[PDB]
Amino acid sequence: AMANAVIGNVVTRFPPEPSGYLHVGHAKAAFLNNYYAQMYEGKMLLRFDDTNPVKYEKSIIEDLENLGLKYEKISYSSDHFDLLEKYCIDMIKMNKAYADDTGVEDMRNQRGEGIESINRNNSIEKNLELFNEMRKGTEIGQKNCIRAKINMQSKNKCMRDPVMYRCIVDVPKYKCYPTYDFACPIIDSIEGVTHALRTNEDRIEQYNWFISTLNLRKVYIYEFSRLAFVKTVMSKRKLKWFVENNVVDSWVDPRFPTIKGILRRGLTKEALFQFILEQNLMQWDKLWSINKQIIDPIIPRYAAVDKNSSILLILTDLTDQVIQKERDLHMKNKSLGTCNMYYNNKYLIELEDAQTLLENEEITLIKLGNIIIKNIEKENGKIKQINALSNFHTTKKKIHWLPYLPQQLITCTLYEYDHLITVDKDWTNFINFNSKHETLVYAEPSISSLKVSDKFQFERRGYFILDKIDPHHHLHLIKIPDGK
Ligand SMILES: [Cl-]
Ligand SMILES: [Cl-]
Ligand SMILES: [Cl-]
Ligand SMILES: [Co+2]
Ligand SMILES: [Co+2]
Ligand SMILES: [Co+2]
Ligand SMILES: [Co+2]
Ligand SMILES: [Co+2]
Ligand SMILES: [Co+2]
Ligand SMILES: [Co+2]
Ligand SMILES: [Co+2]
């Protein structure tokens, strides 16, 4: 619900902290801000929330582009600190704010037991004196913070004189800083936000109090539920730990809930958006199934066999001459176009498939035709070769295959990931330090027409995305989870 939303006069804002990389939680917020702006033909601001002192701007911008989210203007919270100071003084002069030098623990306990602080009835002139000390960074100032003067006996703790301005001397222009709670309603009013979105985890009463106490233009708050996932570390400290200890070797690792990582993992922005519109810690299965049903009809198909367990199949009635036929990259989608298929008398099949055969049995080699198995050569116990006869011109065993043309077979590594932690929510006890499985395969020559980040399907094998191309023509392909 966008309260009193008017077509052409809605302004939302996405306000991420430039203190890290966007993760998928951020994605629900950035998407919903764009979704309500577009619904009402409005505007979406990008605001870097730099309220408290701590260059990720570039990464955030690039993720927001990757998600296809455009914004009308970029701002910083710090852009308005002068204005916030002015309002804080106005607050003091309406006796709506006071300087308090009570310590942290005793202030929490006073707030709990609803007892008004000693300084709550400081004069205006004294409050202004002490705020000036806060502004100049003196030890007096560092002892003081400005609180709003609301209602210490209110049933809602956020209305019990919340802190507005704090003195911060230590960490890197300004010696006092507004709090998030004070900065956020004022900046939203002055930037022209009409509908401010945020997580439902209330501060709504206090935010409204700040706006009306200062007679600013009203701003509506819409709450949404935070999106977080099982078995997913999103604490920035622990992500740092992963990187620093060489568990992953970068912040874009496909096991990281970061936006870059997940796209690298194979997720479409469409799948994420659709999951959000259709949707505590959520389960990944619904998201990857939505992704699969989005990408399956519009990606090519290719074949691959295990490079070393594959068995040599020989059609003994054919010659070594290489026949090549055109085929469709997608059997039920002619737009994706054609590839070239190559065949000979010699083929590669999976040992999984080879050890299921027996003499005088008909099977199909997919996209080629049926063959009749005649014998199985086994040396040392394991299957050495399969001899069959061509019958290309009834069967339940349709298997994939590759031509045994080693100088054209493209060599690939398949990376299959699992979750970095093992429980859903000393934590390092539950790290799967072994969540990156590699398998080497041969694939079809035509797969060389694929470019980086192209998505595709390996027949009877699953879904993959081309992450990188190696020297001497080797591909690195990430398996995309499919839900089932
Ligand atoms: Cl929601
Ligand atoms: Cl965490
Ligand atoms: Cl990597
Ligand atoms: Co429209
Ligand atoms: Co910065
Ligand atoms: Co000091
Ligand atoms: Co799982
Ligand atoms: Co023929
Ligand atoms: Co594993
Ligand atoms: Co490599
Ligand atoms: Co390689």
Side-chain angles (χ1 to χ4, degrees), residues 270-278 281-285 287-324 326 328-331 333 335-345 347-351 353-357 361 363-366 368-369 371-378 380-381 383 385-393 395 399-403:
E270 298 83 24
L272 186 50
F273 297 167
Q274 201 196 305
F275 174 81
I276 291 167
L277 294 170
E278 296 182 16
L281 297 185
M282 304 278 312
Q283 272 303 124
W284 292 94
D285 298 84
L287 177 60
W288 291 118
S289 325
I290 294 191
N291 199 66
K292 182 228 147 192
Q293 55 200 357
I294 285 177
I295 64 177
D296 179 288
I298 62 145
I299 60 179
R301 286 182 91 154
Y302 295 101
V305 288
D306 199 69
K307 184 180 207 164
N308 262 3
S309 39
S310 74
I311 293 322
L312 193 33
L313 166 67
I314 305 201
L315 303 187
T316 77
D317 56 330
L318 311 170
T319 58
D320 66 344
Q321 200 204 48
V322 183
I323 319 296
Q324 73 157 275
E326 218 190 74
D328 295 313
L329 277 169
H330 200 291
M331 225 58 229
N333 187 313
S335 77
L336 303 178
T338 66
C339 55
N340 281 320
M341 182 172 86
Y342 310 81
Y343 67 93
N344 226 38
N345 54 325
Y347 299 91
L348 287 178
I349 59 175
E350 311 284 7
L351 175 146
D353 281 319
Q355 60 196 26
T356 81
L357 314 160
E361 182 203 357
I363 68 172
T364 308
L365 310 183
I366 64 87
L368 185 58
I371 69 173
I372 306 193
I373 307 271
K374 294 268 162 224
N375 46 95
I376 297 147
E377 305 191 351
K378 294 190 206 54
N380 323 325
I383 288 178
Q385 267 195 19
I386 301 276
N387 287 326
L389 286 172
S390 148
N391 193 263
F392 293 147
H393 303 291
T395 170
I399 69 164
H400 70 286
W401 57 273
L402 285 184

Side-chain angles (χ1 to χ4, degrees), residues 300-304 329 339 444 446-447 449-450 456-459:
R301 286 182 91 154
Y302 295 101
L329 277 169
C339 55
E444 272 187 64
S446 51
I447 202 166
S449 57
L450 288 187
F456 63 93
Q457 176 177 8
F458 270 145
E459 184 76 34

Side-chain angles (χ1 to χ4, degrees), residues 83-104 106-112 114-138 140-142 144-154 156 158-169 171-172 174-200 204-216 219-235 239 241-243 245-248 250-259 261-278 281-285 287-296:
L83 210 38
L84 293 159
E85 301 188 2
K86 167 205 170 321
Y87 279 116
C88 174
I89 285 165
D90 297 334
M91 293 270 289
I92 291 161
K93 306 208 303 202
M94 323 159 57
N95 181 64
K96 288 291 178 166
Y98 62 97
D100 204 342
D101 59 16
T102 303
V104 175
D106 295 334
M107 181 176 309
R108 294 270 149 202
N109 296 314
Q110 280 191 278
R111 160 170 310 127
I115 48 186
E116 311 188 352
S117 158
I118 319 90
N119 299 279
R120 196 168 146 132
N121 317 120
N122 276 1
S123 55
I124 297 176
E125 302 74 12
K126 192 200 179 180
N127 287 328
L128 295 175
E129 276 191 18
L130 289 167
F131 182 53
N132 220 74
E133 293 291 339
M134 300 183 50
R135 288 217 284 197
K136 310 188 301 182
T138 69
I140 298 293
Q142 325 178 355
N144 281 277
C145 69
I146 304 302
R147 312 173 67 187
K149 189 203 274 242
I150 305 179
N151 181 8
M152 283 308 301
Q153 304 87 22
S154 157
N156 171 16
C158 287
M159 301 297 275
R160 309 207 204 194
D161 293 7
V163 177
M164 274 171 55
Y165 252 91
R166 289 189 152 111
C167 195
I168 314 190
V169 292
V171 192
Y174 291 86
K175 302 185 221 124
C176 53
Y177 292 89
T179 58
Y180 176 92
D181 279 328
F182 176 58
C184 171
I186 317 306
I187 288 175
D188 277 346
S189 198
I190 56 135
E191 290 205 316
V193 178
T194 59
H195 300 79
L197 269 69
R198 54 202 205 167
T199 41
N200 59 21
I204 295 165
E205 194 178 0
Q206 165 206 97
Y207 180 110
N208 292 335
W209 186 89
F210 276 120
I211 274 162
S212 63
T213 300
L214 285 173
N215 293 311
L216 309 165
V219 179
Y220 307 101
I221 301 160
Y222 188 64
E223 319 186 72
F224 63 92
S225 34
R226 222 142 39 210
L227 177 73
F229 279 99
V230 302
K231 295 141 165 300
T232 316
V233 175
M234 266 162 293
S235 156
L239 305 189
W241 193 94
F242 280 137
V243 180
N245 301 48
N246 316 277
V247 168
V248 307
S250 99
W251 283 88
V252 316
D253 188 281
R255 288 157 292 190
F256 269 25
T258 166
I259 306 293
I262 305 197
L263 293 173
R264 214 192 165 191
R265 190 68 177 275
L267 192 65
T268 56
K269 72 184 196 286
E270 298 83 24
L272 186 50
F273 297 167
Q274 201 196 305
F275 174 81
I276 291 167
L277 294 170
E278 296 182 16
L281 297 185
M282 304 278 312
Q283 272 303 124
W284 292 94
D285 298 84
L287 177 60
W288 291 118
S289 325
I290 294 191
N291 199 66
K292 182 228 147 192
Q293 55 200 357
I294 285 177
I295 64 177
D296 179 288

